[PDB]
Design an enzyme around this catalytic site. Structure first.
Site, short mmCIF file in Angstrom:
data_model
loop_
_atom_site.label_atom_id
_atom_site.label_comp_id
_atom_site.label_asym_id
_atom_site.label_seq_id
_atom_site.Cartn_x
_atom_site.Cartn_y
_atom_site.Cartn_z
NE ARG A 95 -3.36 -0.49 3.08
CZ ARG A 95 -4.07 -0.44 4.21
NH1 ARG A 95 -3.77 -1.21 5.25
NH2 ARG A 95 -5.14 0.35 4.29
CG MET A 106 1.41 0.74 -7.46
SD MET A 106 2.66 -0.49 -7.06
CE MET A 106 1.94 -1.27 -5.65
CG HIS A 456 -6.86 45.34 -12.90
ND1 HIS A 456 -8.15 45.10 -13.34
CD2 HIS A 456 -6.86 46.62 -12.41
CE1 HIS A 456 -8.89 46.18 -13.14
NE2 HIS A 456 -8.14 47.11 -12.56
NE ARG A 562 -4.22 49.49 -2.00
CZ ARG A 562 -4.38 48.32 -1.39
NH1 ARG A 562 -5.52 47.98 -0.85
NH2 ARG A 562 -3.36 47.52 -1.29
CB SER A 767 0.56 50.17 7.86
OG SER A 767 -0.18 49.14 7.23
N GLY A 769 3.61 47.71 3.83
CA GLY A 769 3.07 47.49 2.52
C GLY A 769 3.86 46.41 1.83
CB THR A 770 3.99 42.78 2.37
OG1 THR A 770 2.60 42.62 2.44
CG2 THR A 770 4.50 42.88 3.79
CG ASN A 771 0.68 44.38 -1.93
OD1 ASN A 771 0.67 43.24 -1.46
ND2 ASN A 771 -0.36 45.14 -1.87
CG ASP A 772 4.72 49.44 -3.52
OD1 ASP A 772 5.06 49.24 -4.73
OD2 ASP A 772 3.75 50.17 -3.16
CB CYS A 834 -2.42 47.51 4.79
SG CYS A 834 -1.11 48.63 4.30
CE1 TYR A 854 -2.37 48.39 12.89
CE2 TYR A 854 -3.31 47.61 10.85
CZ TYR A 854 -2.65 48.59 11.58
OH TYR A 854 -2.28 49.74 11.00
N1 LIG Z 1 -3.65 -6.63 4.29
C1 LIG Z 1 -4.90 -6.38 3.87
N2 LIG Z 1 -5.87 -7.27 4.16
C2 LIG Z 1 -7.11 -7.00 3.76
N3 LIG Z 1 -7.56 -5.95 3.07
C3 LIG Z 1 -6.58 -5.10 2.78
C4 LIG Z 1 -5.26 -5.23 3.15
N4 LIG Z 1 -4.53 -4.14 2.70
C5 LIG Z 1 -5.43 -3.40 2.10
N5 LIG Z 1 -6.69 -3.92 2.12
C6 LIG Z 1 -7.89 -3.32 1.56
O1 LIG Z 1 -7.55 -2.82 0.29
C7 LIG Z 1 -8.35 -1.65 -0.02
C8 LIG Z 1 -7.45 -0.58 -0.61
O2 LIG Z 1 -6.41 -0.34 0.37
P1 LIG Z 1 -5.83 1.10 0.67
O3 LIG Z 1 -5.47 0.91 2.07
O4 LIG Z 1 -4.82 1.35 -0.41
O5 LIG Z 1 -6.88 2.20 0.54
P2 LIG Z 1 -6.90 2.92 -0.92
O6 LIG Z 1 -8.33 3.40 -1.04
O7 LIG Z 1 -6.62 2.00 -2.04
N6 LIG Z 1 -5.96 4.35 -1.07
P3 LIG Z 1 -5.85 5.38 0.30
O8 LIG Z 1 -6.78 4.89 1.39
O9 LIG Z 1 -6.00 6.86 -0.08
O10 LIG Z 1 -4.57 5.04 0.99
C9 LIG Z 1 -9.06 -1.25 1.28
O11 LIG Z 1 -10.44 -1.60 1.33
C10 LIG Z 1 -8.32 -2.09 2.34
BR1 LIG Z 1 -9.60 -2.62 3.76
MG LIG Z 2 1.97 51.11 -1.78
MG LIG Z 3 -8.07 3.37 1.93
#
Ligand SMILES: Nc1ncnc2c1ncn2[C@@H]1O[C@H](COP(=O)(O)OP(=O)(O)NP(=O)(O)O)[C@@H](O)[C@H]1Br
Ligand SMILES: [Mg+2]
Ligand SMILES: [Mg+2]
Ligand SMILES: Nc1ncnc2c1ncn2[C@@H]1O[C@H](COP(=O)(O)OP(=O)(O)NP(=O)(O)O)[C@@H](O)[C@H]1Br
Ligand SMILES: [Mg+2]
Ligand SMILES: [Mg+2]
Lengths: 874, 874
Positions: A95, A106, A456, A562, A767, A769-772, A834, A854
């Site tokens: 994961r 991924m 602008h 202004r 005050s 004037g962080t723009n200028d 400002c 402020y």
């Molecule tokens: N070892 C495991 N045993 C069982 N079920 C598992 C296992 N690892 C994962 N899962 C499941 O796989 C699915 C996807 O896992 P993620 O944890 O990646 O969540 P994602 O939605 O894909 N992206 P994110 O949450 O934004 O991180 C989830 O429903 C979990 Br429960």
């Molecule tokens: Mg000015």
């Molecule tokens: Mg998840």
């Protein structure tokens, strides 16, 4: 330990505060394990290991795999299983997980560790049909997610077999079929990529780890970090975890939930569940999720435990939680938890409810509503963004948040006319100009083809809280034909268009709105923020109405009016200003100034009335002289002026040529005018005090302050203050009333900060004037920086636009210098800011740290600056 | 606190080092008394008392007069005389004297303390005619100088008397006549102003003291301090001094001399003498002066003592002295001494002679020639600026010092044509452009309506040492009609005009020039300066010839070669540059760059050859892109560009519009180009090293340095340095030769100084660009500051043009900050400056004090910088 952090039964090496190193997922996986929840054991490879991998030419750094294997030895001992072992197989998931949400990582892979030997044993232990169908699916998903083989090739084999065996559904394949289909899937690897399918689980794992690290540098991930200017992050972590199976029967399943409704904030569990299925099974699209109630009926015991786990997690994190869980034959396993994303309306409801519940205190509650949550609530919003995805035709820069809906026009003049007629106008231009300010104010929304977050159009829009999508390079605007194009699509004058200034989306048609969700819980919440913050929040407003708007949104006064922006309303005012700028004799200048005085006095009266009982700081003229002139050919400018000035054409040509400047931002402007033409300062100061007294006589509490612009020496300030005091004496004598007032200066020139100790002796207040100041410190033209800004961001020269986020090491050093020197020279000095940074949360936090009194920002940014000012404290 | 300082026989309370308090005159009077010279005893009322008098509404502050009387008691006791006592009368002179020469103060009055009783005794004791003529003179002078009565009324009485008594000349009046005439002079007081002549010496004295104090604030004195920018001075001192009488007879007289010839420097007394006359008669210029030989003949003893005293004074002051003396009956009295004003030729001669004599060392000698003296030897000057005051028609910014005289033309082409025909041309334009550089070089003088002292056009002018008056907003140039106007005045092509580039004056007609003086002793003197100075003096030169001129004038290398200024020579170079600026594709850019490479390489060879054995610092491109385009209508510019670019007209329009900038000084220039288009830096670096190796192969010693412009972050510098090193390796590999080189950065952006500790780690050297640094620190546009500079100078907001004299409290603080941080981060860092201040004497002293390694300036300023580096006068 150093790069590999294990977690398992009742223990873990990491914790929830190590998101930076373990990612959100790995950090909470460790946290849940340490609080004694049932989490499948595993290990997390740190984000630093990801960075080392990228820095080592995308190869695992020495020693890392041995640390990984030590962790695996822990997981194997804990599960009493082993990777390649068909008798006691260990299956793993891999994961991704960075410190924050990150698109382009991924996808998670399950059932890593399958091969023929293990599957044969799996077949014997749990059925051939189940084993070889699992093996088949793993070959498909692992190939695609890890090896980059499209699913279409695995599906091609499946359909081929189904065709050649006359079988109509996947479900009709025998275990023998699946066993041969496995061989077909294996072939796909060779046919597509020429590599074999790795039959050793450790090679599958090495490939998965590499793929996750590689995913960090995916084009989608790079674009997300680039656009949003995300800078901290080292890499992604990798979580290798033992498998649990929600697809073993009707006493098994997988689900997800928020502990509270993320749209409404209602304290009620909100989630889905799938009986007899793995996490992967809905993404595969093969199964429809059901409501949580299904889990309660089919697994009353696991459901019961889940509910108490949700209470545990809410108590432990003190927040609404987003959790993922799997049940394997009545045994509940927690697989993920994190702070749950929610809407602005949901954030405020949850925060206020949790306070009423005694679960959190007001200090914590202030940290539970993000500034972006508040911003959603301050503006109109579309009722359902997902419903209009089909109609989006372009995306530009989100110059000014909010939703706008109206009909397309291409002229500020038409926008005013349409607004007068009661029509809703979306003003579409290549760029906007000073002459367009009237129409821009009248338009429901503004869309430009050029310009950045500081154009602008963008800044004026954001001043008024008006929706603006800027820098939409996709559009081509054609005034002559009264259309604009996006590719071959034509959008005509009058056509309905919707703009989302928060996302930059440009949508065809008249989309459905919701009004700003003003409500009681927001008032109570903001009251907590107001009691918490140390900074005051003043307002940058130049008109009575804008002042009133500013007060309605919480402003404690005007930090900047202004005066140069106080003549856009009518032609008569424009005509008078033009007379003053075109003046050659001191009499022509006296005539023009006498015309201007009533407008200044009247507006100051309106501002003072709006800010009854609060301080109002008015700044002397700092005009862009060239901008007060008509747009067009020198034949049209001279003619129009000749009508407005009554001067001979040659006199206008002479004066226009005498006014032209190579670099107007550094030219004859600011206090350089007030000093060269003290009559100008006299007129303005007379308007200020005449208005201050008039409103005083009507029972209005006036607390006036007069500020000098663009000072770089104490002598400039002294000169203008001298004029101010003279005129104050006169007016007070004439009207028989004496008011207390204060005189101060902008600190917007690097020299002013460098000798602030001299300027502090002569000023009641500073005050920044962080723009200028940013413009002069960097040497960046605020009007042209876009020509190299994108390259500088891309090449790592800048991390943000310094005109948006305050440059601490450079500009910030001048701010500290001036503040320190000023207060040393004058213990009663008041110091604010400002510039645009005054409304920007991270800059507000900086300003608080430096000990300013402020911040001042445009009216609709006041609530944001308020909450920002409270969040740095608590 | 003491305000009255006495001086007398062998004693004095002040000394020569108290000029600020006692004035030059009072200080040297005390000094001469203290070294035992016969100085008539007296007292000096301080400049503080003058300031107190001016701050007390032009009235004597309370205890001052009693302090004056105490001093008078000293004088009386010392002279054994008393005011008003006819038996032993004390007579006094009242003499103004500030710290420095100052026109508009009260003339000296003599014989103060006379009335009828005193004069009756004076007559008896020293001759009636002497007494009454002295009385009569005092009545006239006191009435005019103190009471404001024109001399013409006293003369009217004198002439009336001569007419009635039939005598023709004043000297023919008897003592009886004079006795009658004083009564008439008394009447003049009544008739003229209704005043009586004050008969009490103490009242005479009170009035004289007041008048001197009042004279400090005279219009003529105010104007002198204003135009010369003299700031500091509190007031004038008043010297009240006992009288001695050079008009008692032919054994009495008065004289002045310089101890050496102030024109030639010859060691021989140079002065005048008047037998039987008062110092008044020397001022009046009526009596024919007699030579000093006349004194030697008629008063031998006094002459012998005078010669002795002149040697004493030269030894004591170690300089040539300007002395005034009076002989009263064979007794010599010293009445004034000060360092004698002299010509540049005289200064050098005197300095070298005094060294040869063993009177001073080379250290002191280098202080005896002012930078203005050296400037008189090296450059043309107008013979007497005040004499042409009547012909001045306008005054602009002094862009480049010097005197030019020529005929008006309005075209760079005509200027070169005229120069070829042997005519002298004053080139008059609204603005100059790259294409005008040829004519600018050929013109005797340049007059522009726009631009500042540091606008690159002016910078190029000062490179050549060519007189240039810029920013003359009074003039309106008309090319078509071939005239230019100032108000209602028309000046035609061919008319004679004179420019004073030091004062910015524009003078009608052909004005007289001072003849340049050849000095044989200047080489040895400059040699002493060269040995004395610590700072090295590098040159700002962009061409081989300019580099050679710089070396001839003493430059020890090139501190700045501006590569942007290396394409003016021919049209082919300009076209190549235009092809590069208009490029849209990387191919068009590669083409243009390939065309530019041979010019750059060729020029660098010539520069390296000229500077054989000395370091040459080449700076990467920092171009005004807008300035590189043709002049004319957008119809002509697009066509001309279309022919040589071969791009479509619409592509040229779009590119021109995309290149235009609101503030180019803060826009897409400097390292912002080199970073955005690394191919550009590649080309330049390749030319640099290819030239360096080629010249090395020809036996030339090349010491190359490559400098990055407009850096504000360490990332910018790092980026460009990376490119430089890559190219360096390639060329050295290709040509089989490896040269040592250095890489560095301009510090011309306030941020670069603010984080210099980061930039220092990555640079071999810093060079302060104080032109841009001043621009960014003050927020003053270098091209447009002239619109308010005069007002700021007039109102006491600025003491000097910060673009001319370095602002120590502001810009100077960034210089110290950067230098300190840089050297802490990199102990071997070299730090220089190449802004215009590098050639300005007071700024060079500051740069010495901050510990810079060198200053770099344009070639004709190298000699002044060298002397300024030796003098180090703050
Ligand atoms: N070892 C495991 N045993 C069982 N079920 C598992 C296992 N690892 C994962 N899962 C499941 O796989 C699915 C996807 O896992 P993620 O944890 O990646 O969540 P994602 O939605 O894909 N992206 P994110 O949450 O934004 O991180 C989830 O429903 C979990 Br429960
Ligand atoms: Mg000015
Ligand atoms: Mg998840
Ligand atoms: N007590 C005195 N007895 C006799 N003669 C005297 C006496 N005091 C002065 N004088 C003379 O008076 C003349 C004018 O005096 P100043 O000091 O004013 O010199 P100025 O040229 O006019 N201004 P300067 O430029 O500062 O020098 C000089 O010739 C002197 Br010697
Ligand atoms: Mg004199
Ligand atoms: Mg520069």
């Amino acid at each position: 330990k150093k790069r590999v952090f294990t977690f398992g039964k009742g223990r873990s090496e990491g914790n929830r505060d190590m998101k930076s190193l373990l990612g959100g997922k790995g950090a909470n996986l460790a946290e849940m394990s340490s609080i004694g929840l049932s989490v499948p054991p595993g290990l997390t490879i740190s984000t630093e290991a990801c960075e080392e991998y990228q820095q080592n030419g995308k190869s695992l750094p020495p020693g890392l795999w041995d640390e990984i294997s030590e962790g695996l030895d822990y997981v194997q001992k804990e599960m009493s299983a082993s990777l390649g072992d068909p008798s006691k197989p260990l299956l793993l998931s891999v994961r991704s997980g960075a410190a924050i949400s990150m698109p382009g990582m991924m996808d998670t892979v399950l059932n890593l560790g399958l091969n023929d030997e293990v599957v044969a044993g799996l077949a014997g232990k749990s059925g051939a049909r189940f084993a070889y169908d699992s093996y088949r699916r793993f070959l498909d998903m692992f190939g695609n997610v890890v090896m980059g083989i499209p699913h279409s090739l695995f599906d091609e084999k499946l359909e081929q077999m189904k065709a050649e065996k006359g079988i109509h559904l996947d479900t009709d394949l025998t275990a023998a079929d699946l066993k041969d289909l496995v061989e077909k899937y294996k072939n796909v690897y060779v046919e597509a990529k020429g590599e074999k399918f790795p039959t050793d689980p450790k090679k599958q794992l090495e490939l998965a780890v590499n793929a996750v690290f590689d995913s960090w540098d995916s084009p989608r991930a790079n674009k997300y970090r680039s656009i949003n200017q995300i800078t901290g992050l080292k890499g992604t972590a990798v979580n290798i975890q033992s498998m649990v199976f929600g697809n073993m029967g009707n006493t098994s399943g997988t689900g997800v939930l928020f502990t509270r409704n993320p749209s409404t904030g209602e304290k009620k569990l909100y989630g889905e569940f799938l009986i007899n299925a793995q996490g992967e099974d809905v993404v595969a699209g093969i199964r429809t999720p059901e409501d949580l109630g299904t889990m309660e009926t089919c697994m009353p015991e696991a459901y019961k435990e889940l509910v108490e786990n949700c209470e545990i997690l809410e108590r432990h994190y003190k927040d609404m939680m987003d959790i993922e869980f799997t049940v394997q034959e009545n045994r509940l396993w927690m697989l993920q938890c994190r702070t749950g994303k929610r809407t602005g309306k949901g954030a405020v409801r949850i925060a206020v409810d949790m306070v009423n519940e005694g679960l959190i205190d007001t200090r914590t509650a202030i940290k539970r509503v993000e500034t972006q949550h508040l911003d959603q609530l301050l503006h109109p919003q579309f009722e359902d963004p997902s419903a209009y995805k089909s109609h989006v035709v372009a995306t530009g820069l989100p110059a000014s948040p909010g939703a706008a809906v109206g009909q397309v026009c291409f002229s500020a003049e038409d926008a005013e006319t349409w607004h007068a007629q009661g029509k809703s106008a979306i003003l579409v231009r290549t760029e906007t100009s000073p002459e367009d300010v009237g129409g821009m104010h009248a338009a429901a929304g503004i869309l430009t083809a050029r310009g950045g977050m500081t154009s602008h159009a963008a800044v004026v829009a954001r001043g008024w809280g008006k929706c603006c999508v800027s820098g939409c390079a996709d559009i081509r605007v054609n005034d002559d034909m009264k259309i604009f194009t996006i590719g071959d699509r034509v959008i005509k004058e009058g056509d309905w268009l919707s703009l989302n200034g928060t996302t930059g989306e440009v949508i065809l048609g008249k989309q459905l709105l919701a009004p700003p969700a003003m409500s009681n819980d927001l008032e109570i919440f903001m009251s907590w923020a107001d009691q918490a913050r140390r900074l005051k929040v003043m307002a940058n407003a130049d008109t009575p109405n804008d002042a009133l708007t500013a007060r309605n949104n919480g402003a404690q006064g005007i930090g900047l009016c202004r005066t140069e922006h106080m003549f856009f309303a009518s032609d008569e005012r424009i005509k008078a200003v033009r007379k003053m700028i075109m003046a050659v004799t001191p009499e022509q200048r006296k005539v023009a100034l006498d015309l201007l005085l009533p407008y200044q006095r009247s507006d100051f009266e309106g501002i003072f009335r709006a800010m009854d009982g609060l301080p109002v700081t008015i700044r002397l003229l700092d005009p862009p002289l060239h901008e007060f002139l008509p747009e067009g050919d020198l034949e049209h400018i001279v003619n129009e002026l000749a009508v407005d000035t009554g001067m001979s054409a040659d006199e206008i040509y002479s004066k226009i040529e005498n006014l032209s400047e190579v670099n107007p931002m550094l030219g004859f402007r600011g206090c350089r005018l007030g000093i060269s033409y003290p009559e100008l300062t006299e007129m303005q100061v007379r308007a200020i005090f005449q208005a201050a007294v008039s409103m005083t006589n009507q029972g209005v509490t006036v607390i006036p302050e007069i500020m000098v612009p663009l000072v770089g020496t104490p002598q400039e300030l002294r000169h203008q203050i001298s004029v101010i005091r003279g005129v104050a004496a006169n007016v007070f004598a004439e009207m028989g009333v004496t008011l207390e007032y204060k005189v101060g200066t902008m600190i917007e020139i690097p020299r002013a900060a460098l000798i602030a100790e001299e300027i502090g002796k002569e000023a009641d207040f500073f005050s920044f004037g962080t723009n200028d100041l940013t413009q002069m410190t960097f040497g960046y033209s605020r009007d042209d920086v876009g020509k190299f800004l994108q390259i500088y961001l891309a090449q790592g020269i800048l991390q943000h636009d310094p005109f948006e986020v305050i440059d601490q090491k450079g500009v910030g050093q001048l701010i500290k210098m001036a503040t320190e020197k000023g207060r040393a020279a004058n213990p009663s000095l008041k110091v604010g800011i400002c510039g645009e940074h005054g409304g920007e949360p991270s800059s507000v936090a900086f300003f608080d740290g430096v000990g300013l009194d402020y911040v001042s920002c445009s009216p609709f940014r006041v609530p944001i600056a308020r909450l920002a000012a409270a969040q740095v404290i608590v």
